Amino acid sequence: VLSPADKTNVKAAWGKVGAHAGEYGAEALERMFLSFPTTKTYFPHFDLSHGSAQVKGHGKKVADALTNAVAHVDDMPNALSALSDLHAHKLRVDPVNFKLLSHCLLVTLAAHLPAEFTPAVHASLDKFLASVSTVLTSKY
Amino acid sequence: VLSPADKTNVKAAWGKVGAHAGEYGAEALERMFLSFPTTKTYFPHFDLSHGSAQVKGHGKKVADALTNAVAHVDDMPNALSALSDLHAHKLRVDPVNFKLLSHCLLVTLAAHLPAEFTPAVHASLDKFLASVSTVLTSKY
Amino acid sequence: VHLTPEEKSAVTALWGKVNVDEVGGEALGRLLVVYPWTQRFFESFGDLSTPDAVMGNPKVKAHGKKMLGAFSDGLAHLDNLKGTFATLSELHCDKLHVDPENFRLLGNVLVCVLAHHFGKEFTPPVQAAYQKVVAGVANALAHKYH
Amino acid sequence: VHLTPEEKSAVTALWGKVNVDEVGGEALGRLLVVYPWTQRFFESFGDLSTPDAVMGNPKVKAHGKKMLGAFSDGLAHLDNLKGTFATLSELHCDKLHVDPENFRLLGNVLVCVLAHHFGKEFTPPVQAAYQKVVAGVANALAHKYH
Ligand code: HEM
Ligand code: HEM
Ligand code: HEM
Ligand code: HEM
Structure with missing residues (x-):
């Protein structure tokens, strides 16, 4: 359950992501594949090497869905x-696996948004990513 | 997210619990304390021995809250x-700890409702207990 | 790490009554029904559309007996499950890429199945003993992930 | 189980730049803010009402340095963390009754803090190396729960 403060924090932090949305999505994915190799088996038809056009394209899709979630x-x-x-x-x-990707998204955000990634915003982003994960796992 | 079928299954299974509601709550708690000793530290002022009047009383409260959840x-x-x-x-x-108690509630239900505890109902009860757990952890 | 003599007693006494062939199909079946993403590892098994289909599926009971076979085997070697489950650990971890959380869920499902089957006989101390067992088996299987 | 030489290289090179005193307060603070139930173990620390209060709390930074001290110590002994964390394992497990999932969360928070501090230098392979480390420390601390 996101508080008014959480939504403000999430909208603000993600708003600072800007034209990098795609790029950060791709990096979170790469961080996940390298830190948690079991996840790679979901993308047997992707080349998962650094700089892979497929990972880049997919990261943009992941980022766009997160943006849809922020927007609504x-x-x-x-x-x-x-x-x-x-x-x-x-x-x-x-x-x-949603917890793994969520963690790697926080790490990516932390690595790119020094100013924005305060403890409060960190907490807000974590809850946001958990709620997103809840929705995406909700039809089992 | 509970399906229409889940709600039917949960209402039916819990409806068969009847006057044992209190008793089963108490047993789930005892199962939790014995299987997962780290949980005991939440009740330092309870006697947690078998047959403890405090565990019995508390199990009834836990069962009543589950009933409220089923009813709404x-x-x-x-x-x-x-x-x-x-x-x-x-x-x-x-x-x-909510996952631990939820598991012990399923075990208790399994142990007392041979007929009702089908695979389908098991799945429904698990999701129900997870949704309850989500709500109870939702204000952090 | 170590079961107490009373825990060992609880485990072995109950397991001597377990129909190995049947309890295996049941636990695997319930895993697939209760945690539907686990079906992703068994695409070959055919029809898994409904709970009845899953439980009645020949391939599921066949493999569930295999699985529980390894478990029944695991109980006669409770001292070092690590070495005992090594072949299975590499298989599940290096080749199948099953997330170890699933080992934990399967053990808990097995506990639910035992409770269902034994009712009042599956007492809280008996359960506590089996929770140590299923956690040990889960950890042994996960060792190759570390 | 074992870091590759390149992973060891990633870990040690980065840690030589870590302000041990500061990164500790920060990770503990963020744990308490991000996972508020963890505050239950630190009732003595005084004001933890708001994020600023938590981060600015003297008791939190003091203990965070202690915690990370044990971690910094843990890196000079990466071969057997089990023996290395034994005193702490009994303490956290037998006496404090911290659920081991919290060890995992703390390690992930630490990773977030390192990422925050080092930015682009905290690359995905550098992260992957630290994930093996924080998981090892977490497992070592949890050993007395098994
Ligand atoms: C924040 C959580 C997640 C978001 C927002 C997300 C988003 C998306 C989106 C938008 C697509 C559609 C791509 C397209 O239509 O071209 C997709 C597909 C997919 N997702 Fe996710 N996802 C998430 C978590 C995960 C995780 C944890 C995994 C597995 C580790 C995963 C595995 C996949 C796979 C395998 C596809 C199909 C890719 C393909 O076949 O081209 N997703 N996801
Ligand atoms: C299905 C999940 C749960 C339900 C429905 C539930 C229900 C309740 C209810 C109804 C009360 C109020 C008792 C009263 O007013 O007298 C209560 C209190 C309490 N609960 Fe839970 N609870 C759940 C999970 C947990 C878990 C997992 C823990 C810890 C392991 C826990 C620890 C406590 C404690 C320590 C109290 C206060 C008891 C006292 O001080 O007398 N609860 N719970
Ligand atoms: C937790 C206790 C488990 C035990 C003791 C166990 C045991 C076994 C055994 C004995 C086999 C046969 C290996 C062989 O043919 O030599 C096997 C295969 C297999 N297991 Fe498990 N298993 C467990 C959990 C799981 C889980 C949770 C999953 C998936 C969610 C899984 C997926 C598979 C698959 C897909 C195979 C077929 C691999 C093959 O034969 O090529 N296992 N397991
Ligand atoms: C995961 C890595 C962790 C490490 C390396 C670590 C390390 C330490 C160290 C070095 C001490 C001081 C022990 C002493 O005075 O000899 C300590 C104490 C303590 N730890 Fe941790 N800790 C970790 C995680 C946690 C977590 C997640 C919690 C709670 C959620 C926690 C709760 C406590 C508490 C309450 C004390 C004070 C006990 C006392 O000094 O009497 N620790 N820890």
Whole structure:
């Protein structure tokens, strides 16, 4: 459950992401694949090397979905509807893996937003990513 | 997110619990304390021995709150409002511990409801207990 | 790390009554029903569309007996499960890439199945003993992830 | 289990730049802010009402330096963290009853703090190396729970 403060913090921090949205998504994915190799088995048809055009393209999609979630933070289940179905039915993504990607997104944000990544904003982003993860795992 | 089928399954299984509601709550607690000793530190003022009047009394409270949740399954956050505040603010219960108690409640239900505890109902009860746990940890 | 004699007693006494062939199919089946993402590792098993389909699936009971076989084997070697589960650890970790959290869930499902089957006989101390066992098996299987 | 030479290289090179005194207060502080139930173990520390209060709390930085001290110590002994963290394992497990999941969260917070501090220098392979470290420390601390 996001507080008014959380939503403010999330909108502000992600607003500072700007044209890097795609790029940061791709980096979070690479961080996940390298730190948590079990996740790689979901992308057997991706080249997961550094600089992979496929990871870059996919990171932009992941970032865009996060942006949709920020833009509609009061009704994320509705907004992420098709994605919930995809990850649970079609892909059958293990819920543990959402925690891994969420952590790597925080690390990426931390690494790129020195000023914005305060303890308060960190807490807000963590809860936001957990709520997103809840929605994406909600149709099992 | 509980499906129509989940709510039916949960209402039916818990409906079969009847006058044992209190008793089963107490047993789930005892199962938790014995299987997961770290949980005991939340009740330093309870005697946690088998047959403890305090555990029995508390199990009835836990069972009653579950019943409230079943009775208002479409708006659990509202229904469990005061309890969410208690467990997060006052008691600061570690979210891991809700998974432990939830498991021990399933075990108790399994041990007492041979007929009702089908695979489908098991799945439904697990999701129900997870949603309850989500609400009770929602005010951190 | 070590079961007490009373815990060992609880485990072995109960397991002597377990229908190895049946309890295995049941736990695996319930894992697949209760935690549906776990089906992703068994695409070959055919029909897993509904709970009845999953439980009644020949491939699921067959493999569940295999799984529990390894478990039944694991109980006769409770001293060092690490060495005992090594072949299975590499398999599950290096080749299947099962997240170790699933080992924990399976053990808890098994506990639910035992409770279902034994009812009042599956007492809280008996359960506590089996929780140490299923955690040990889970950790042994996860060792190759470390 | 074992860091590769390149991972060891990543860990030690970065840690030589870490302000041990400061990074400790920061990680503990962020743990208490981000995962508020963890405050339950530090009732003695006084004011923890707001994020600024928590981060600015003298008792939190003092103990965070202690904590990270044990961590900084843990890096000079990466071969057997189990024996290395034994005193702390009994303390945290037998006496404080901290759930081991919290060891995992703290390690991940530490990773976030390192990322914050080092920015681009905290690359994905550098992170991957530290994830193996924080997981090792977490597991070593949890050993007495098994
Ligand atoms: C914040 C959490 C997540 C978000 C926002 C997200 C977002 C997305 C989006 C937007 C797509 C559609 C891509 C497209 O239509 O081209 C997608 C697909 C996919 N996702 Fe995720 N995802 C998340 C978590 C995960 C995790 C944890 C995994 C596995 C470790 C995963 C695995 C996949 C896979 C395998 C696809 C299909 C890719 C393909 O076949 O091209 N997702 N995700
Ligand atoms: C299904 C999940 C849970 C439910 C429905 C639940 C329900 C309740 C209820 C109804 C009360 C109020 C008792 C009263 O007013 O007399 C309560 C209090 C309390 N709960 Fe829970 N609880 C749950 C999970 C947990 C867990 C996992 C823990 C810790 C391991 C916990 C620890 C406590 C403690 C320490 C109290 C105060 C007891 C006292 O001081 O007398 N609860 N809970
Ligand atoms: C936690 C206790 C578990 C035990 C004791 C166990 C045991 C076994 C055994 C004995 C085999 C047969 C290996 C062989 O043919 O030599 C096997 C195979 C397999 N296991 Fe498990 N398992 C466990 C958990 C899991 C879980 C949770 C999953 C997936 C979610 C899983 C997925 C698989 C798959 C897909 C195979 C087939 C691999 C093959 O034969 O090529 N296992 N396991
Ligand atoms: C995960 C890595 C951790 C490390 C390396 C660590 C290290 C330490 C150290 C060195 C001490 C001082 C022990 C002494 O005075 O001899 C300590 C004490 C303490 N730790 Fe941790 N800790 C960790 C995680 C945690 C977590 C997650 C919590 C709680 C959520 C926690 C709670 C405490 C408390 C309450 C004390 C004070 C006990 C006392 O001095 O009487 N620790 N820890």
